[PDB]
Design a binder for this molecule. Structure first.
Ligand SMILES: [Cl-]
Ligand SMILES: [Cl-]
Ligand SMILES: [Cl-]
Ligand SMILES: [Cl-]
Ligand SMILES: [Cl-]
Ligand SMILES: [Cl-]
Ligand SMILES: [Cl-]
Ligand SMILES: [Cl-]
Ligand SMILES: [Cl-]
Ligand SMILES: [Cl-]
Ligand SMILES: [Cl-]
Ligand SMILES: [Cl-]
Ligand SMILES: [Cl-]
Ligand SMILES: [Cl-]
Ligand SMILES: [Cl-]
Ligand SMILES: [Cl-]
Ligand SMILES: [Cl-]
Ligand SMILES: [Cl-]
Ligand SMILES: [Cl-]
Ligand SMILES: [Cl-]
Ligand SMILES: [Cl-]
Ligand SMILES: [Cl-]
Ligand SMILES: [Cl-]
Ligand SMILES: [Cl-]
Ligand SMILES: [Fe+2]
Ligand SMILES: [Fe+2]
Ligand SMILES: [Fe+2]
Ligand SMILES: [Fe+2]
Ligand SMILES: [Fe+2]
Ligand SMILES: [Fe+2]
Ligand SMILES: [Fe+2]
Ligand SMILES: [Fe+2]
Ligand SMILES: [Fe+2]
Ligand SMILES: [Fe+2]
Ligand SMILES: [Fe+2]
Ligand SMILES: [Fe+2]
Ligand SMILES: [Fe+2]
Ligand SMILES: [Fe+2]
Ligand SMILES: [Fe+2]
Ligand SMILES: [Fe+2]
Ligand SMILES: [Fe+2]
Ligand SMILES: [Fe+2]
Ligand SMILES: [Fe+2]
Ligand SMILES: [Fe+2]
Ligand SMILES: [Fe+2]
Ligand SMILES: [Fe+2]
Ligand SMILES: [Fe+2]
Ligand SMILES: [Fe+2]
Ligand SMILES: [Fe+2]
Ligand SMILES: [Fe+2]
Ligand SMILES: [Fe+2]
Ligand SMILES: [Fe+2]
Ligand SMILES: [Mg+2]
Ligand SMILES: [Mg+2]
Ligand SMILES: [Mg+2]
Ligand SMILES: [Mg+2]
Ligand SMILES: [Mg+2]
Ligand SMILES: [Mg+2]
Ligand SMILES: [Mg+2]
Ligand SMILES: [Mg+2]
Ligand SMILES: [Mg+2]
Ligand SMILES: [Mg+2]
Ligand SMILES: [Mg+2]
Ligand SMILES: [Mg+2]
Lengths: 172, 172, 172, 172
């Protein structure tokens, strides 16, 4: 094994590789959303900027896991990054609802990774997830929930002013 | 011929004179729109400012072509600047749609000028158009498309708040 | 069609979507290389930083094409980002040689895209490629060639000091 | 018991005293290494500085545990600090390999302390170890692994330039 490896189970190593792929996938979903909002027939520039920022954060999340793999003496194994489920995200509200579902799915994967790390007696990996992932996920889910609620109440997507006003006053 | 003239076809010289006239015409259309929006019964001051700025940019476009004519040893031949198709532009949305059509028409003229310059083996003129005109036109058309989409979705021109809110939040 | 679309052939639109995928693939290859060099049994931190920077530049290249698609009224169609050919890049020299091959392959794709844009009489797309892609590619290929030559002459990968010294004095 | 003591098992108190001794021992090992590298027949001043810094960090680690003992109402019980296994550390590579082994041994002790704290339902002590010790150890082990790899590849200790160049370019 790696001269650095200590208390690092092969199952944890493999689960970290799966998590890297999921974070890169989330990054790709958000990149797709960002450029949907800059279409000439959508043109919600602050929705675009919001999702572009989320995309870049997800790439940061992937990289921190790649660094962890190296720090612990595991070996990064990359896989294809699957394309997002849609190119046409329909509306600001629909994109927000899809982002909320994505974040809950990523959160579930992180909770499963934490349960594995616990089962394998890996407190370093548990602390890593708690310190950098789990609260970030809760904050992200709460923010998306807030945004979905306001858009629904405002009458998105059919009320003509709703996404326009939310773009300029919440995301601006 | 001019002591400076080199590789500059008379057909290119004539086409540049026609393009100067078209750019001055576009400037005049936008000047007309700017002052429509400052009527007491329209009073959308940021629509006014937006089109005034576009007017000044079109005069810049005309002048750069006039400079090119001199640089290449051609002779500027000015023609009447025709009045715009309307004085009453009806609404912010209608003005935006008319501006989009104008910009596409000017773009078509520039593409024809580029095809002529190509046919005449004039890479200086091709590069001039590519460097200063063609991307500017694509950016302008995209911006106008964005604005038309938002105004349509917001319910302009009949929805009482739409042009008012777009004036203050997009064009402000 | 899109209210913005003008002189933009469907074949160009499709070729731009393929180019976006290739640029994202190049970004992924370089990300893989960056993290190879931070393995405890490789530990060439400036090779790592160099390839991380190249990765981020390739994502910028993909995004500028995504923006072009929107600007011209085409529709972005994303595909899976295939995993790199290797996770273990063997040595600093091997990674540099693989990067050089990648860049030549991406360059060939851009030259084919330029030939298509020319065939379709799309001078905006030709200028876009010339302005932002073609010289960047030539500079990148030349830089990688320089690096490969120095590493070969220094005796990489087998000469114990070669990659270490190149890491600290060229890439540092 | 101490008026402050709460949820603090005597076995945890004793294990913290053993950990204090181990951290002071690690500090002493690194102090020995630092002064080996300043011998006139070794004279690798940046190896010296690197290990002196590590020595001071280990004393900080001991002190934070001494503070924890007081904070929790336990009583510090100091023991002899055993001398290091060697005074003559042989080479820069050998010292690095010995430091890596030491750090893995200290890490194993901290993981055992964390397992004890878990068994005793002491989440304060678990969090203390995770927050201040476990990631520090992983970072330290990874850094030492990196250094060992580069020194081995460079040909240390027998290749005349290897430790000299690593001293000046990595540790400088
Ligand atoms: Cl292990
Ligand atoms: Cl795969
Ligand atoms: Cl796959
Ligand atoms: Cl644990
Ligand atoms: Cl909100
Ligand atoms: Cl709700
Ligand atoms: Cl001539
Ligand atoms: Cl006339
Ligand atoms: Cl006339
Ligand atoms: Cl030519
Ligand atoms: Cl807009
Ligand atoms: Cl529309
Ligand atoms: Cl078209
Ligand atoms: Cl696909
Ligand atoms: Cl595919
Ligand atoms: Cl062309
Ligand atoms: Cl070089
Ligand atoms: Cl060579
Ligand atoms: Cl107690
Ligand atoms: Cl004792
Ligand atoms: Cl003793
Ligand atoms: Cl507990
Ligand atoms: Cl190192
Ligand atoms: Cl090694
Ligand atoms: Fe975020
Ligand atoms: Fe952020
Ligand atoms: Fe994430
Ligand atoms: Fe698929
Ligand atoms: Fe996320
Ligand atoms: Fe815990
Ligand atoms: Fe924690
Ligand atoms: Fe987030
Ligand atoms: Fe403009
Ligand atoms: Fe301007
Ligand atoms: Fe113009
Ligand atoms: Fe007339
Ligand atoms: Fe224009
Ligand atoms: Fe313009
Ligand atoms: Fe407002
Ligand atoms: Fe580069
Ligand atoms: Fe750069
Ligand atoms: Fe590229
Ligand atoms: Fe495959
Ligand atoms: Fe490239
Ligand atoms: Fe490059
Ligand atoms: Fe040097
Ligand atoms: Fe340290
Ligand atoms: Fe320090
Ligand atoms: Fe320590
Ligand atoms: Fe003894
Ligand atoms: Fe230590
Ligand atoms: Fe340390
Ligand atoms: Mg060994
Ligand atoms: Mg997966
Ligand atoms: Mg934008
Ligand atoms: Mg004369
Ligand atoms: Mg005319
Ligand atoms: Mg005014
Ligand atoms: Mg229409
Ligand atoms: Mg492809
Ligand atoms: Mg690094
Ligand atoms: Mg009392
Ligand atoms: Mg002991
Ligand atoms: Mg000294």
């Amino acid at each position: 094994p790696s001269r650095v490896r200590q208390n690092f189970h092969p199952d944890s190593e493999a689960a970290i590789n799966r998590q890297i792929n999921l974070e890169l996938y989330a990054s790709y979903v958000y990149l797709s959303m960002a450029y949907y909002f800059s279409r000439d027939d959508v043109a919600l520039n602050n929705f675009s900027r919001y999702f572009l920022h989320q995309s870049r954060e997800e790439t940061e999340h992937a990289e921190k896991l790649m660094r962890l793999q190296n720090q612990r003496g595991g070996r990064i194994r990359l896989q294809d990054i699957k394309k997002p489920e849609q190119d046409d995200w329909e509306s600001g509200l629909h994109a927000m609802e899809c982002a909320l579902l994505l974040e809950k799915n990523v959160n579930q994967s992180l909770l499963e990774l934490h349960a594995l790390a616990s089962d394998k007696g890996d407190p370093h990996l548990c602390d890593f997830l708690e310190t950098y992932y789990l609260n970030e996920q809760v904050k992200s889910i709460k923010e998306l929930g807030d945004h979905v609620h306001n858009l629904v109440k405002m009458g998105a997507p059919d009320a003509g002013l709703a996404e326009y006003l939310f773009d300029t006053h919440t995301l601006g």
